[PDB]
């Protein structure tokens, strides 16, 4: 599920005008046109930081992993971060970061929450899911052993404790081989992360088409603002410059409208992402095709650029 988008800001001076004194004096007759379009791109960039707060951090309390690891006869080291690296990243999130790939009054706003601190929200909430059980988000965290977690996670779907304790050596052949096919599939093909690659590609095609409106003449003879003032008459140059300012603001009104529609589509996906962190990760659900296909056991979140990767 994607969470956040690329935050942009558009200058009114550099995109509309070529830094000429005639274009800035005629912009003050137009007034508040690009004042509201600067304000509407500001209100996108506030809500992109609110999408990361409701998804990645459910609780304000940070839990850590003990250094002596034996949990149920399983290998949990692929979802846990590496202490030997200076960056905190797990073995799956090394594969997740690498498969997802100016002036003129455009810019690129940097995000507030860094990707190092998304993985510190990931490794804290994986510390509560593996060790502390389901009670870390509903209150203070209990101490539940891992053999006592899955007996009561079988109890919600109708399975008693006869199945788990006899077959516990046979689950380690099933669970460790199933998570090893996830690591081999994400390293071979980048097409599973292609929903997050479109969020880069919808923002890249929006910026590249917006700078190609400058070469289009918009009904004027010349598209250069310096070539109108140095050639045509001063009654004639008030007509031909104002055809270009009317044409470039219609391309700017096209851009801010299409970002607000994609802000509404990324709001409903992040509210779906904040629901599945609250339901599937922090608890057990009886739902069908929400926490994954079939019965629900548990869910492991992973960090992703412009989104989140769930392991069901």
């Amino acid at each position: 599920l994607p969470v956040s988008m690329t935050k942009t800001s558009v200058d009114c001076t550099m995109y509309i005008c070529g830094d000429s004194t005639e274009c800035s004096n005629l912009l003050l007759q137009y007034g508040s046109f690009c004042t509201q379009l600067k304000r509407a791109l500001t209100g996108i960039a506030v809500e992109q930081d609110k999408n990361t707060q409701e998804v990645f951090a459910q609780v304000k309390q940070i839990y850590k992993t003990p250094p002596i690891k034996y949990f149920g006869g399983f290998n949990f080291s692929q979802i846990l971060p590496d202490p030997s690296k200076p960056s905190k990243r797990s073995f799956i999130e090394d594969l997740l970061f690498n498969k997802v790939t100016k002036f003129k009054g455009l810019t690129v706003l940097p995000p507030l929450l860094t990707d190092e601190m998304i993985a510190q929200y990931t490794s804290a909430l994986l510390a509560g899911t593996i060790t502390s059980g389901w009670t870390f988000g509903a209150g203070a965290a209990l101490q539940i052993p891992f053999a006592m977690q899955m007996a009561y996670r079988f109890n919600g779907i109708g399975v008693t404790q006869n199945v788990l304790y006899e077959n516990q050596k046979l689950i380690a052949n099933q669970f460790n081989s199933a998570i090893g096919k996830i690591q081999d599939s994400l390293s071979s093909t980048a097409s599973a992360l292609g929903k997050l690659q479109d969020v880069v590609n919808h923002n890249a095609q929006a910026l590249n088409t917006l700078v190609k409106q400058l070469s289009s003449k918009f009904g004027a003879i010349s598209s250069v603002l310096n070539d109108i003032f140095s050639r045509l008459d001063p009654p004639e140059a008030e007509v031909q410059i104002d055809r270009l300012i009317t044409g470039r603001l219609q391309s700017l009104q096209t851009y801010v409208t299409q970002q607000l529609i994609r802000a509404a589509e990324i709001r409903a996906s992040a509210n779906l992402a904040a629901t599945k962190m609250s339901e599937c990760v922090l608890g057990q659900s009886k739902r069908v095709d929400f926490c994954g296909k079939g019965y629900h056991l548990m869910s492991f979140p992973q960090s992703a650029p412009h989104g989140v990767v769930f392991l069901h």
């Binding site: 003990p66 203070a140 400058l214």
Partner: protein
């Protein structure tokens, strides 16, 4: 060279700087353009040299301030600009209030090494707040308190004490 000035080249006008072009060009070429219908390369007709044109006046101005009933001290955020080369306020160019971040540099605020919960965000992990003879401080936003729980093979925690909490959602 290396000054932002006005250009008049064969009737064409522009504003920018002149740097040396290392790209192989045609000998019959008068000029060349960019990705838009905009320039980069001109030819000096008296003595033949082709110089690149990089435009000037880039970057935004952002301000960080508390309310007018609290304090009038304003921290100024420079946006996306390398601050080694550097509004009508020239007093903060003396130095020692500057801290270099990824998003820019923040002048008028003292960087601290502690980690707290802030109010006014900046970006790229660095936040800001107005704390204590009071000024604007800037630091890295905390994740909350640290809880280290020892886990073993056999241990369990059963809560013996209860409370009833009332929360409000709007």
């Amino acid at each position: 060279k290396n000054k932002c000035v006005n250009f008049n080249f064969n009737g064409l006008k522009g504003t920018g700087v002149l740097t040396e072009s290392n790209k192989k060009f045609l000998p019959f070429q008068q000029f060349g353009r960019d990705i838009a219908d905009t320039t980069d390369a001109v030819r000096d007709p008296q003595t033949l040299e082709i110089l690149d044109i990089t435009p000037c006046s880039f970057g935004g101005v952002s301000v960080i301030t508390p309310g007018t009933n609290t304090s009038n001290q304003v921290a100024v955020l420079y946006q996306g600009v390398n601050c080694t080369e550097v509004p009508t306020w020239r007093v903060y160019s003396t130095g020692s209030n500057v801290f270099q971040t990824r998003a820019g540099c923040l002048i008028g605020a003292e960087y601290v090494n502690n980690s707290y919960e802030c109010d006014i965000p900046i970006g790229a992990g660095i936040c800001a707040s107005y704390q204590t003879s009071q000024s604007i401080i800037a630091y890295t936003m905390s994740l909350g308190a640290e809880n280290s729980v020892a886990y073993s093979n056999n241990s369990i925690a059963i809560p013996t004490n209860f409370t009833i909490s009332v929360t409000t959602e709007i």
